């Protein structure tokens with residue numbers, strides 16, 4: 065196998081530093097069942 | 105009793121993969137470099153002196169460096185950065201003599 | 202909602218050691234304990250101990266407090282909620298009363314008063330402790346017999362005679378013929394050797410439309426035998442149909 | 444074992460059956476938890492009840508538990524043919540481990556009778572060149588699991604080389620067994636025929652092969 | 657929030673055993689270059 | 705103990721219910737390229753008030769925890785009390801009920817405080 | 831029945847009081863020309879919090895419906911109970927009381943929860 069230097073797309077240069085990061089959104093609203101009822 | 109009832113919880117550790125608008129941060133010593141705003145750091149938010157990193161125990165999340173949007177956002181930032189820095193600069197239109 | 206697979210059955214002489222593995226899949230290996238329970242024909246079911254892959258904490262029974270070592274490998278992530286792992290256990294100072302089946306079990310819950318409780322179990326690994334050496338089996342073909350003349354049914358099989366130690370798995374046509382297969386338990390002879398029998402019920406009209414090959418496997422001796430059961434019977438009550 | 448259960452208990456189809464599980468105060472039952480397991484011989488056990496009265500995930504509501512201050516109980520309503528097996532209980536806590544009981548063999552009554560299917564095999568040609576001779580008496584599909592096997596050499600009792608296995612439960616909720624007779628190549632060619640008598644509930648079945656033909 | 661993978665061996669794709677969360681990523685210098693990556697973050701143990 | 709923001713993410717729901725006041729605290733947090741953060745922090749409060757509006761129109765308003773008079777339908781992944789809070793994470797749980805999340809929300813805003821509060825107006829006049 | 835957003839607009843006040851949780855739900859809803867919507871959606875949450883602030887400083891906080899300890903002045907269009915909720919729409923009603931709307935608002939924020947809550951501080955110390 066033969067390997068040669070490349071590049072061109074500068075987006076690759078950022079991937080070498082952003083490989084350990086990703087964006088997520090927090091959705092704090094979660095419903096769950098339990099034996100608890102409110103008042104009347 | 106034995107029959108369950110729903111209960112609303114606010115502040116649960118629940119997240120999903122998405123894309124948003126990220127902002128910048130670049131220390132406080134970098135702003136002291138001045139020289140009429142070098143590169144980008146002009147109205148950039150000063151970096152938190154004591155950053156916090158919370159290790160999420162028992163958590164296994166899948167990453168994808170090739171399908172990460174932070175790159176496509178950063179790339180469009182540096183490009184736009186290049187244009188804004190050349191707008192108030194001297195145009196060499198009559199140098200094609 | 203996963204699967205626990207252990208190593209094959211081994212034969213060990215008393216005084217020596219043996220290491221039984223237990224590979225898991227289909228769930229997070231570190232989120233549940235790994236219990237080890239054995240069962241002999243003299244002391245009944247006995248709980249040996251458990252170990253938490255997350256922390257590494259162990260709790261052995263006083264009976265196995267000074268001759269049993271439990272070890273677990275690191276978790277290998279597959280998905281965000283499932284993974285693959287492997288748990289081991291090492292019992293030293295083997296004796297004659299240590300002969301039986303050893304099981305590994307997954308814990309029930311993560312938190313509560315019954316976290317370590319054995320819920321999901323493996324298939325078990327048979328352990329035989331004897332001074333006797335390993336002896337290969339002798340497979341003999343069983344001639345087809347008449348089961349029902351008016352029904353047009355028959356029954357053929359193979360004979361596994363004189364083997365040691367247990368167990369022995371018998372399949373047909375590389376696992377193609379499974380229906381009507383009845384495998385009987387072995388017998389403990391006076392010599393100390395075992396011998397079982399396998400028989401599959403098949404119609405009499407099937408002769409040159411299906412090949413009957415019984416697959417007897419004996420891993421302890423590392424030998425496999427493929428016998429071609431002759432479809433031509435000798436039963437006079439079946440010869441009428443032919 | 445220090446944990447004592449009932450030796451044997453029975454129950455009819457469509458009915459219920461209670462299994463006892465007691466012992467000293469050191470194992471039962473104050474400040475102790477009780478669990479139950481369906482453990483078929485030779486197979487893998489299945490968790491039924493955990494924490495006294497709570498059912499395991501995927502367990503039919505036909506099972507129910509109850510613990511007193513001196514003993515615990517397990518009621519199996521609407522009995523099934525596949526419920527006839529051995530059931531063990533376990534005394535445990537959050538810290539300590541498991542202490543299994545003596546065991547309980549549950550017999551389901553009210554089941555239909557099943558005539559045994561017996562097939563006797565003569566010694567193969569490959570064994571006659573060894574040379575040996577082994578008669579194979581296979582027993583299957585009989586209920587309950589309790590049969591006796593006697594051998595005869597030309598209508599004459601055999602007391603040498605007679606061995607019979609223990610009745611084992613199959614997958615179709617029935618029992619099976621196997622008997623073998625060790626003979627010499629001379630006796631196989633000196634006797635007109637050999638038989639395999641199987642007795643069950645007074646009724647005795649018999650299959651006979653003949654070397655003469 | 658921004659999640660950060662903290663395992664020493666990670667090819668950028670797949671599940672991560674040791675995950676941590678942060679508000680701001682580390683100082684990433686936008687060095688524009690080709691063929692040779694300059695002034696970047698060094699890998700752990702074996703080269704990746 | 706304080707694991708921090710999103711600390712008990714891998715912990716059980718019962719355990720993570722102790723860390724509710726932590727993820728709630730850091731949820732709001734107090735020329736171009738500067739408009740990058742403006743449009744982002746505007747969406748930040750819109751995202752906050754959106755959940756707060758739902759949290760208000762339901763029988764809650766008071767954040768963190770609150771009960772409701774809605775029977776748990778077995779079709780919504782029939783699990784037991786000890787099998788949810790002591791054997792499942794919030795991430796793992798939200799993955800199953802995600803199909804019925806929009807359904808449950810409707811039974812909280814409409815069926816409850818619209819019928820409950822109107823019921824109270826009849827009880828408070830006497 | 832669900833007539834939808836602004837459904838019972840032509841219906842009586844008593845009937846339209848059943849559709850309160852509907853107009854409240856769709857009230858917040860989750861280079862130039864793109865700044866057109868930004869400045870608009872910013873005013874959207876300011877308009878929301880404005881009403882929410884009034885709804886909070888009064889003896890309400892809890893949305894939809896709430897009672898108050900203010901006697902209805904006859905000068906504010908003296909109508910009867912059955913002549914308001916069963917013979918008048920909210921649009922038609924708001925047209926008459928529009929003159930006294932600012933007056934009533936003052937009797938709710940000042941006269942009540944400033945004197946009521948302070949009263950409670952005296953009742954809660956004992």
Ligand SMILES: *[C@@H]1O[C@H](CO)[C@@H](O[C@@H]2O[C@H](CO)[C@@H](O[C@@H]3O[C@H](CO[C@H]4O[C@H](CO[C@H]5O[C@H](CO)[C@@H](O)[C@H](O)[C@@H]5O)[C@@H](O)[C@H](O[C@H]5O[C@H](CO)[C@@H](O)[C@H](O)[C@@H]5O)[C@@H]4O)[C@@H](O)[C@H](O[C@H]4O[C@H](CO)[C@@H](O)[C@H](O)[C@@H]4O)[C@@H]3O)[C@H](O)[C@H]2NC(C)=O)[C@H](O)[C@H]1NC(C)=O
Nearest residue numbers: 161162232233234253255259311312313314316537714715
């Ligand atoms: C990430 O995931 C992991 C895995 O999923 C998870 O770990 C589980 O955490 C839960 C709690 O949330 C654990 O469940 C509890 O376990 C308690 C531990 O049991 C005690 O007893 C052990 C046995 O002691 C015997 O043996 C020793 C010899 O070894 C002997 O000397 C003793 O005398 C005794 O005979 C003991 O070893 C163990 O000690 C460990 O823990 C202490 C801290 O407590 C630590 O200092 C030690 O170094 C050692 O690591 C421990 O003392 C158990 O007590 C507990 O039961 C009580 O609590 C529940 C409530 O949870 C009550 O309802 C109940 O009534 C009891 O009061 C409970 O069972 C579980 O065991 C973990 N492991 C698993 C599931 O594999 C992490 O928490 C997760 N973390 C995050 C951040 O997500």
Ligand SMILES: *[C@@H]1O[C@H](CO)[C@@H](O[C@@H]2O[C@H](CO)[C@@H](O[C@@H]3O[C@H](CO)[C@@H](O)[C@H](O)[C@@H]3O)[C@H](O)[C@H]2NC(C)=O)[C@H](O)[C@H]1NC(C)=O
Nearest residue numbers: 081682683684685686687692693694695696697698699700
């Ligand atoms: C080029 O690579 C070299 C590595 O050979 C870089 O030198 C290293 O720089 C790092 C900081 O980026 C130093 O780490 C520091 O270590 C001290 C030790 O206590 C710690 O207290 C600091 O917090 C920090 O982590 C590292 O020591 C240093 N290496 C040596 C041998 O001194 C160099 O900075 C790189 N140049 C660039 C990126 O322009």
Ligand SMILES: *[C@@H]1O[C@H](CO)[C@@H](O[C@@H]2O[C@H](CO)[C@@H](O)[C@H](O)[C@H]2NC(C)=O)[C@H](O)[C@H]1NC(C)=O
Nearest residue numbers: 277278279280284665666667668669670671672
């Ligand atoms: C990155 O590493 C992961 C290991 O975590 C690789 O995933 C495995 O890939 C092999 C083949 O390359 C498969 O046989 C395994 O089943 C994969 N494991 C899992 C959990 O998916 C992944 O392929 C690697 N990526 C690249 C581009 O090499």
Ligand SMILES: *[C@@H]1O[C@H](CO)[C@@H](O)[C@H](O)[C@H]1NC(C)=O
Nearest residue numbers: 496497498499500784785786
């Ligand atoms: C669910 O848990 C409760 C504990 O209160 C128990 O009584 C019940 O039998 C359990 N049901 C099932 C189906 O596990």
Ligand SMILES: *[C@@H]1O[C@H](CO)[C@@H](O)[C@H](O)[C@H]1NC(C)=O
Nearest residue numbers: 775776777778779780804811
């Ligand atoms: C519960 O879900 C089922 C769907 O499986 C549905 O038919 C039923 O109406 C639901 N229960 C109620 C009370 O709506």
Ligand SMILES: *[C@@H]1O[C@H](CO)[C@@H](O)[C@H](O)[C@H]1NC(C)=O
Nearest residue numbers: 781798799800801802803804
């Ligand atoms: C949710 O629904 C989708 C299809 O609508 C289905 O594929 C998925 O399995 C469902 N979730 C669960 C937990 O069953």
Ligand SMILES: *[C@@H]1O[C@H](CO)[C@@H](O)[C@H](O)[C@H]1NC(C)=O
Nearest residue numbers: 901902903904905906930937
């Ligand atoms: C009611 O309105 C009249 C004006 O017609 C005013 O004089 C009177 O003071 C008002 N009542 C109260 C209690 O303020």
Ligand SMILES: *[C@@H]1O[C@H](CO)[C@@H](O)[C@H](O)[C@H]1NC(C)=O
Nearest residue numbers: 907924925926927928929930
């Ligand atoms: C409100 O006041 C204006 C003048 O201030 C008056 O013209 C109008 O009639 C009043 N509204 C009603 C319903 O009377």
